[PDB]
PDB file of C-alpha atoms (C1' of nucleotides) in Angstrom:
ATOM      1  CA  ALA A 227     -19.703   6.523 -25.926  1.00 14.62           C
ATOM      2  CA  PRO A 228     -16.423   4.375 -26.381  1.00 17.98           C
ATOM      3  CA  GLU A 229     -14.634   7.817 -27.033  1.00 18.15           C
ATOM      4  CA  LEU A 230     -16.571   8.895 -23.709  1.00 18.39           C
ATOM      5  CA  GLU A 231     -14.199   6.220 -22.574  1.00 19.16           C
ATOM      6  CA  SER A 232     -11.632   7.123 -23.916  1.00 21.56           C
ATOM      7  CA  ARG A 233     -10.348   8.833 -20.638  1.00 19.99           C
ATOM      8  CA  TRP A 234     -12.708   7.177 -18.629  1.00 23.51           C
ATOM      9  CA  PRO A 235     -11.126   5.948 -15.592  1.00 23.83           C
ATOM     10  CA  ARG A 236     -12.950   2.958 -15.910  1.00 27.45           C
ATOM     11  CA  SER A 237      -9.448   1.280 -16.554  1.00 27.35           C
ATOM     12  CA  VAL A 238      -8.470   2.123 -13.500  1.00 26.55           C
ATOM     13  CA  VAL A 239     -11.042  -0.163 -11.765  1.00 27.22           C
ATOM     14  CA  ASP A 240     -10.430  -2.855 -14.429  1.00 23.04           C
ATOM     15  CA  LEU A 241      -6.860  -3.109 -12.593  1.00 22.85           C
ATOM     16  CA  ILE A 242      -7.588  -3.197  -8.679  1.00 22.46           C
ATOM     17  CA  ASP A 243      -9.644  -7.116 -10.082  1.00 21.38           C
ATOM     18  CA  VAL A 244      -6.390  -7.790 -11.936  1.00 18.79           C
ATOM     19  CA  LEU A 245      -4.117  -7.246  -8.719  1.00 18.22           C
ATOM     20  CA  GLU A 246      -6.612  -9.346  -7.268  1.00 13.48           C
ATOM     21  CA  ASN A 247      -6.642 -12.173  -8.538  1.00 11.37           C
ATOM     22  CA  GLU A 248      -2.591 -12.892  -8.514  1.00 12.80           C
ATOM     23  CA  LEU A 249      -3.461 -11.753  -4.731  1.00 10.45           C
ATOM     24  CA  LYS A 250      -6.309 -13.813  -4.139  1.00  9.77           C
ATOM     25  CA  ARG A 251      -4.467 -16.526  -5.910  1.00 14.65           C
ATOM     26  CA  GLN A 252      -1.012 -15.814  -4.226  1.00 14.45           C
ATOM     27  CA  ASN A 253      -3.246 -15.765  -0.778  1.00 14.75           C
ATOM     28  CA  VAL A 254      -2.237 -12.549   1.224  1.00 17.88           C
ATOM     29  CA  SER A 255      -4.505 -11.652   3.931  1.00 19.90           C
ATOM     30  CA  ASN A 256      -6.613  -8.537   2.391  1.00 19.61           C
ATOM     31  CA  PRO A 257      -7.175  -8.328  -0.861  1.00 21.28           C
ATOM     32  CA  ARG A 258      -9.485  -4.986  -1.647  1.00 19.95           C
ATOM     33  CA  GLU A 259      -6.799  -2.436  -0.028  1.00 21.53           C
ATOM     34  CA  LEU A 260      -3.909  -3.439  -0.936  1.00 22.80           C
ATOM     35  CA  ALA A 261      -5.100  -3.357  -4.517  1.00 23.53           C
ATOM     36  CA  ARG A 262      -5.631  -0.340  -4.681  1.00 22.65           C
ATOM     37  CA  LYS A 263      -2.954   1.458  -3.723  1.00 22.32           C
ATOM     38  CA  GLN A 264      -0.963  -0.465  -4.914  1.00 22.29           C
ATOM     39  CA  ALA A 265      -2.631   1.282  -8.166  1.00 19.77           C
ATOM     40  CA  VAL A 266      -2.127   4.245  -7.133  1.00 19.42           C
ATOM     41  CA  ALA A 267       1.442   4.522  -6.918  1.00 18.41           C
ATOM     42  CA  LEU A 268       1.038   2.730 -10.894  1.00 20.18           C
ATOM     43  CA  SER A 269      -1.070   6.247 -11.404  1.00 17.38           C
ATOM     44  CA  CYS A 270       1.237   8.398  -9.887  1.00 14.37           C
ATOM     45  CA  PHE A 271       4.063   7.053 -11.084  1.00 15.08           C
ATOM     46  CA  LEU A 272       2.388   6.825 -14.922  1.00 15.06           C
ATOM     47  CA  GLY A 273      -0.126   9.283 -14.683  1.00 16.83           C
ATOM     48  CA  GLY A 274      -0.474  11.616 -18.269  1.00 20.15           C
ATOM     49  CA  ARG A 275       1.849   9.657 -20.301  1.00 20.46           C
ATOM     50  CA  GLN A 276       2.702   7.503 -23.352  1.00 19.27           C
ATOM     51  CA  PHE A 277       3.879   3.675 -21.951  1.00 20.29           C
ATOM     52  CA  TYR A 278       4.520   0.645 -23.941  1.00 25.46           C
ATOM     53  CA  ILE A 279       3.702  -2.403 -21.565  1.00 27.47           C
ATOM     54  CA  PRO A 280       4.983  -5.409 -23.061  1.00 27.73           C
ATOM     55  CA  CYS A 281       1.806  -6.807 -24.835  1.00 26.61           C
ATOM     56  CA  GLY A 282       0.811 -10.338 -26.058  1.00 26.87           C
ATOM     57  CA  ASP A 283       3.030 -13.013 -23.721  1.00 26.44           C
ATOM     58  CA  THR A 284       6.162 -11.431 -24.514  1.00 28.56           C
ATOM     59  CA  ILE A 285       6.512 -12.078 -20.448  1.00 31.45           C
ATOM     60  CA  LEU A 286       4.545 -15.580 -20.461  1.00 32.08           C
ATOM     61  CA  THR A 287       7.353 -16.563 -22.905  1.00 30.26           C
ATOM     62  CA  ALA A 288      10.197 -16.519 -19.868  1.00 29.61           C
ATOM     63  CA  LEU A 289       8.123 -18.167 -17.079  1.00 30.31           C
ATOM     64  CA  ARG A 290       6.817 -20.604 -20.328  1.00 31.00           C
ATOM     65  CA  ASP A 291      10.982 -20.423 -21.244  1.00 33.88           C
ATOM     66  CA  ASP A 292      12.469 -21.771 -17.622  1.00 37.79           C
ATOM     67  CA  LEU A 293       9.987 -24.914 -16.872  1.00 40.75           C
ATOM     68  CA  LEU A 294      10.722 -26.112 -20.339  1.00 40.26           C
ATOM     69  CA  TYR A 295      14.027 -26.024 -19.175  1.00 41.81           C
ATOM     70  CA  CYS A 296      13.456 -27.676 -16.728  1.00 40.39           C
ATOM     71  CA  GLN A 297      11.618 -30.987 -18.215  1.00 39.63           C
ATOM     72  CA  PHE A 298      14.269 -30.933 -21.396  1.00 36.67           C
ATOM     73  CA  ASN A 299      16.074 -33.539 -19.594  1.00 34.50           C
ATOM     74  CA  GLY A 300      18.357 -34.784 -22.748  1.00 32.60           C
ATOM     75  CA  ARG A 301      15.677 -37.904 -24.693  1.00 33.37           C
ATOM     76  CA  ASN A 302      12.237 -36.004 -24.786  1.00 37.35           C
ATOM     77  CA  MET A 303      12.926 -33.449 -27.257  1.00 34.55           C
ATOM     78  CA  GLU A 304       9.981 -34.505 -28.857  1.00 33.81           C
ATOM     79  CA  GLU A 305       7.524 -35.103 -25.648  1.00 30.79           C
ATOM     80  CA  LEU A 306       8.416 -31.374 -24.767  1.00 33.30           C
ATOM     81  CA  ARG A 307       7.438 -30.056 -28.356  1.00 34.62           C
ATOM     82  CA  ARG A 308       4.062 -31.178 -28.723  1.00 35.41           C
ATOM     83  CA  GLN A 309       3.567 -30.746 -24.968  1.00 32.37           C
ATOM     84  CA  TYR A 310       4.060 -27.049 -25.482  1.00 35.42           C
ATOM     85  CA  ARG A 311       3.682 -26.852 -29.751  1.00 36.34           C
ATOM     86  CA  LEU A 312       7.100 -25.410 -30.491  1.00 35.90           C
ATOM     87  CA  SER A 313       9.432 -27.097 -32.322  1.00 36.15           C
ATOM     88  CA  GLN A 314      12.234 -28.242 -33.006  1.00 34.73           C
ATOM     89  CA  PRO A 315      14.811 -24.554 -33.597  1.00 28.48           C
ATOM     90  CA  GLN A 316      12.809 -22.994 -31.029  1.00 31.42           C
ATOM     91  CA  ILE A 317      13.724 -26.365 -28.639  1.00 30.26           C
ATOM     92  CA  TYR A 318      17.189 -26.444 -29.418  1.00 29.12           C
ATOM     93  CA  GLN A 319      17.949 -22.488 -28.793  1.00 28.93           C
ATOM     94  CA  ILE A 320      16.148 -22.132 -25.716  1.00 26.03           C
ATOM     95  CA  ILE A 321      17.911 -25.474 -24.438  1.00 24.52           C
ATOM     96  CA  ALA A 322      21.296 -24.098 -25.372  1.00 22.62           C
ATOM     97  CA  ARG A 323      20.121 -20.599 -24.010  1.00 24.15           C
ATOM     98  CA  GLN A 324      19.365 -21.949 -20.468  1.00 27.89           C
ATOM     99  CA  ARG A 325      22.004 -24.234 -20.122  1.00 28.20           C
ATOM    100  CA  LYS A 326      25.032 -21.140 -20.642  1.00 30.16           C
ATOM    101  CA  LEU A 327      22.352 -19.592 -17.641  1.00 32.24           C
ATOM    102  CA  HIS A 328      23.405 -22.696 -15.582  1.00 29.99           C
ATOM    103  CA  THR A 329      26.216 -23.394 -16.359  1.00 29.48           C
ATOM    104  CA  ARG A 330      26.961 -19.343 -15.471  1.00 31.95           C
ATOM    105  CA  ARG A 331      24.621 -20.390 -12.129  1.00 34.02           C
ATOM    106  CA  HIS A 332      27.072 -23.790 -11.205  1.00 35.85           C
ATOM    107  CA  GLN A 333      30.347 -21.981 -12.251  1.00 31.68           C
ATOM    108  CA  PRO A 334      31.349 -18.843 -10.463  1.00 34.14           C
TER     109      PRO A 334
ATOM    110  C1'  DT B 165      24.573  84.921  50.833  1.00 32.46           C
ATOM    111  C1'  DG B 166      20.755  82.362  52.085  1.00 31.82           C
ATOM    112  C1'  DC B 167      16.569  80.798  49.779  1.00 31.54           C
ATOM    113  C1'  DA B 168      12.980  78.087  47.856  1.00 30.78           C
ATOM    114  C1'  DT B 169      12.578  75.330  43.986  1.00 32.84           C
ATOM    115  C1'  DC B 170      13.109  71.898  40.049  1.00 29.11           C
ATOM    116  C1'  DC B 171      15.199  67.432  38.305  1.00 28.34           C
ATOM    117  C1'  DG B 172      17.552  62.481  38.775  1.00 27.95           C
ATOM    118  C1'  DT B 173      18.712  58.809  41.463  1.00 28.25           C
ATOM    119  C1'  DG B 174      17.122  53.817  43.717  1.00 30.71           C
ATOM    120  C1'  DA B 175      18.473  44.609  41.788  1.00 30.97           C
ATOM    121  C1'  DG B 176      18.566  40.450  40.746  1.00 31.29           C
ATOM    122  C1'  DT B 177      16.292  36.639  38.149  1.00 29.88           C
ATOM    123  C1'  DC B 178      11.458  34.993  38.342  1.00 24.68           C
ATOM    124  C1'  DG B 179       5.119  32.416  37.808  1.00 27.03           C
ATOM    125  C1'  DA B 180      -0.371  33.180  36.642  1.00 26.92           C
ATOM    126  C1'  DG B 181      -3.494  35.474  35.154  1.00 26.97           C
ATOM    127  C1'  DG B 182      -4.904  39.506  31.891  1.00 28.89           C
ATOM    128  C1'  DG B 183      -8.592  42.616  31.298  1.00 29.25           C
ATOM    129  C1'  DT B 184     -12.620  47.055  31.815  1.00 33.69           C
ATOM    130  C1'  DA B 185     -15.773  51.764  30.346  1.00 34.00           C
ATOM    131  C1'  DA B 186     -19.450  58.462  32.413  1.00 34.76           C
ATOM    132  C1'  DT B 187     -21.884  59.210  27.481  1.00 39.82           C
ATOM    133  C1'  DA B 188     -23.691  60.686  22.434  1.00 38.13           C
ATOM    134  C1'  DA B 189     -30.296  62.053  17.021  1.00 35.67           C
ATOM    135  C1'  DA B 190     -31.527  61.610  13.177  1.00 34.48           C
ATOM    136  C1'  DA B 191     -34.093  62.388   8.729  1.00 35.54           C
ATOM    137  C1'  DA B 192     -31.963  63.877   3.635  1.00 34.04           C
ATOM    138  C1'  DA B 193     -29.238  63.510  -1.181  1.00 36.63           C
ATOM    139  C1'  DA B 194     -24.768  62.078  -2.509  1.00 33.22           C
ATOM    140  C1'  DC B 195     -21.556  59.363  -4.043  1.00 32.29           C
ATOM    141  C1'  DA B 196     -18.265  55.508  -4.014  1.00 32.21           C
ATOM    142  C1'  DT B 197     -17.339  51.001  -4.624  1.00 30.88           C
ATOM    143  C1'  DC B 198     -17.519  46.317  -4.380  1.00 30.99           C
ATOM    144  C1'  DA B 199     -19.868  41.833  -5.398  1.00 30.47           C
ATOM    145  C1'  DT B 200     -21.372  38.461  -8.367  1.00 28.61           C
ATOM    146  C1'  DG B 201     -22.861  36.870 -13.201  1.00 26.78           C
ATOM    147  C1'  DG B 202     -21.643  35.946 -17.816  1.00 28.87           C
ATOM    148  C1'  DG B 203     -18.687  36.355 -21.572  1.00 30.04           C
ATOM    149  C1'  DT B 204     -13.716  36.607 -24.224  1.00 29.64           C
ATOM    150  C1'  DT B 205      -8.608  34.090 -24.205  1.00 29.31           C
ATOM    151  C1'  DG B 206      -6.227  31.190 -23.365  1.00 28.00           C
ATOM    152  C1'  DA B 207      -3.512  28.406 -22.043  1.00 28.02           C
ATOM    153  C1'  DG B 208      -3.260  24.099 -20.760  1.00 30.61           C
ATOM    154  C1'  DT B 209      -3.430  19.476 -19.891  1.00 30.95           C
ATOM    155  C1'  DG B 210      -5.342  14.958 -23.018  1.00 34.70           C
ATOM    156  C1'  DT B 211      -5.375  11.290 -26.823  1.00 33.80           C
ATOM    157  C1'  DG B 212      -4.793   9.694 -30.439  1.00 31.60           C
ATOM    158  C1'  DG B 213      -1.096   8.802 -34.673  1.00 31.26           C
ATOM    159  C1'  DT B 214       3.216   7.156 -38.496  1.00 27.60           C
ATOM    160  C1'  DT B 215       8.336   5.618 -38.302  1.00 25.54           C
ATOM    161  C1'  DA B 216      12.728   3.919 -36.116  1.00 25.31           C
ATOM    162  C1'  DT B 217      13.879   0.079 -34.547  1.00 26.20           C
ATOM    163  C1'  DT B 218      17.089  -5.636 -32.139  1.00 27.62           C
ATOM    164  C1'  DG B 219      15.986  -9.845 -30.302  1.00 29.92           C
ATOM    165  C1'  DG B 220      13.820 -14.727 -31.494  1.00 28.02           C
ATOM    166  C1'  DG B 221      12.677 -18.194 -34.626  1.00 28.69           C
ATOM    167  C1'  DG B 222      12.960 -19.475 -38.603  1.00 27.63           C
ATOM    168  C1'  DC B 223      15.080 -22.876 -43.652  1.00 24.92           C
ATOM    169  C1'  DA B 224      19.306 -23.264 -46.040  1.00 24.66           C
ATOM    170  C1'  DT B 225      23.725 -25.196 -46.305  1.00 25.95           C
ATOM    171  C1'  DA B 226      26.468 -27.862 -45.206  1.00 23.84           C
ATOM    172  C1'  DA B 227      28.791 -30.917 -41.865  1.00 24.46           C
ATOM    173  C1'  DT B 228      30.068 -36.373 -38.332  1.00 25.63           C
ATOM    174  C1'  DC B 229      28.247 -40.058 -36.011  1.00 22.76           C
ATOM    175  C1'  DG B 230      25.572 -44.856 -36.192  1.00 22.51           C
ATOM    176  C1'  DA B 231      23.850 -49.729 -37.836  1.00 22.24           C
ATOM    177  C1'  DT B 232      24.877 -53.968 -42.220  1.00 21.23           C
ATOM    178  C1'  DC B 233      26.654 -56.953 -47.156  1.00 22.92           C
ATOM    179  C1'  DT B 234      31.018 -57.322 -50.741  1.00 23.13           C
ATOM    180  C1'  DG B 235      36.701 -57.218 -51.546  1.00 21.50           C
ATOM    181  C1'  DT B 236      41.763 -59.022 -49.513  1.00 24.07           C
ATOM    182  C1'  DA B 237      45.919 -63.550 -47.151  1.00 23.81           C
TER     183       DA B 237
END
DNA sequence: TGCATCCGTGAGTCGAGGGTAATAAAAAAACATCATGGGTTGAGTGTGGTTATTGGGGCATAATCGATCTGTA
């Protein structure tokens, strides 16, 4: 049965909902139809091929990282370390990185 | 020389329906041939698998402030 599902399109189905919950959350008109055509593009784009999808929050780091730099206010280095369960080295690194990032924004 | 005889000629763009029909023999055998259906090749498209990683975070080993009790005219 699992091996039967191995080549099963069940994965396709699982995805329309993955698209649904963000589209419904973002509140756009007509979830279902938008997401199915949305999937068809992926099917043609990625038909019959090995693909590494960035796994296990790697993208979510970048968004976790952006908010943290926004809440870094110069003396709360302990506060956001509890509330993200991160550590001193992590905090320092992200801080310096996003600081350079914004400095490229303010500076030409 | 006169006679009949045959052989090419003769506009131009345009439109709309546009196709119709006097008749007729059956058996048999014989053969050709395509049509479907079932089975080997074979030709794929399908799917997991080991091994090259390059940013990131991390602990060492160093370093430059911040706050108070002992020594010198």
